[PDB]
Amino acid sequence: GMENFIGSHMIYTYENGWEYEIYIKNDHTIDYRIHSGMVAGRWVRDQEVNIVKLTEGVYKVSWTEPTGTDVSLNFMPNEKRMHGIIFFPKWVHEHPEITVCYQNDHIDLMKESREKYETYPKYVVPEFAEITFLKNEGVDNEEVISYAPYEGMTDDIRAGRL
Amino acid sequence: GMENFIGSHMIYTYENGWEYEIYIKNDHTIDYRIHSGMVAGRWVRDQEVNIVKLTEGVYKVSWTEPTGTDVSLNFMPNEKRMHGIIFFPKWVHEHPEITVCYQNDHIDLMKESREKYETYPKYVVPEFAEITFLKNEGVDNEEVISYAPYEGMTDDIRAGRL
């Protein structure tokens, strides 16, 4: 149920092996942390989101970012699968490393960049991923995502050694 | 199933009574037509979309628009409900009537406007709606959404008189 979904700390893994981590911190907030790929190293705390239950076993988590990126994710916890679509401004695709930071401390840079560089055409990425780690960390657990990704961290998260 | 979803011609109705119409014309294309509200009169043909089946009974239809608007919809046909999130550039919220047209014949205006006016902060609208009309019109039926909305048209669609 929704009570079970809120608090979920997940890693999901794309076909190419990229690992993305999310924590459903409360009914309107996520933290997230990206371990691989185009924006590996990016992490975000206290992102306001819309979270709804679409039907039994299906949740939707959606938000807009200070960079302009729009995201709509669906999670299907019982099937250990998610789907996401990300609508990136062109500039995020062309200058991804600008976005690779603890975004919360670089909002002004995100805003400068979204005005400086081109938005269109957008780079739109819809893709499924497998949910390859799940633990409920409770609500408003501020320790779950509290520093940048480091080498081997996803192994450490799955091992429960942190 | 997906074969049943593709071809769906729907009207869905928000709590405020606004009626939005969509036609899932093929596995990567929609047409749509808005009868009420902020952008009443807007209609679009041949919009490329991502359509996936998330699980039994749950579909996702998502796309970006020439105006910059990003949309991610979920349909739950058996429960006669949908959820959508729309991420509007600020300018679409402030100048909605620019977008009220047959968009296909005004792409240059959409592109001029998305560059002329402000994008941020976005106006983001997540909302459920009830699916209040459904008929499968087949695949690539070019007559389903082929002119602008007019007074009473949704009654005419539900009556099957067109």
Swiss-Prot record, chains A, B:
Enzyme class: lyase
EC number: 4.1.1.102
UniProt xrefs under InterPro entries: Calycin, PA_de_COase
SUPFAM superfamilies, alphabetized: Lipocalins (SSF50814)
Active site: 20 (proton donor), 65 (proton acceptor)
Domain of life: Bacteria
GO molecular function, one term: carboxy-lyase activity
Reactions mediated catalytically: (E)-4-coumarate + H(+) = 4-vinylphenol + CO2; (E)-cinnamate + H(+) = styrene + CO2; (E)-ferulate + H(+) = 2-methoxy-4-vinylphenol + CO2
Gene Ontology biological process terms from the UniProt entry: catabolic process; response to toxic substance
Keywords: Aromatic hydrocarbons catabolism, Decarboxylase, Detoxification, Lyase
Disruption phenotype annotation: No longer metabolizes ferulic acid.
Phenotypic consequence of residue 20 to A: 4% decarboxylation of ferulic acid
Binding site for substrate: 12, 14, 42
Induction remarks: By ferulic, p-coumaric and caffeic acids (at protein level). Cells extracts from caffeic acid-induced cells exhibited lower activity on the three acids, which indicates that caffeic acid could be a less efficient inducer. Up-regulated by salicylate.
Summary of pH dependence: Optimum pH is 5.0.
Family that this chain belongs to: Belongs to the PadC family.
Record PANTHER family: PHENOLIC ACID DECARBOXYLASE PADC
Function: Involved in the decarboxylation and detoxification of phenolic derivatives. It is able to catalyze the decarboxylation of ferulic, p-coumaric and caffeic acids.
Subunit-structure text: Homodimer.
Protein name: Phenolic acid decarboxylase PadC
Biological source species: Bacillus subtilis (strain 168)
Gene that this polypeptide is encoded by: padC
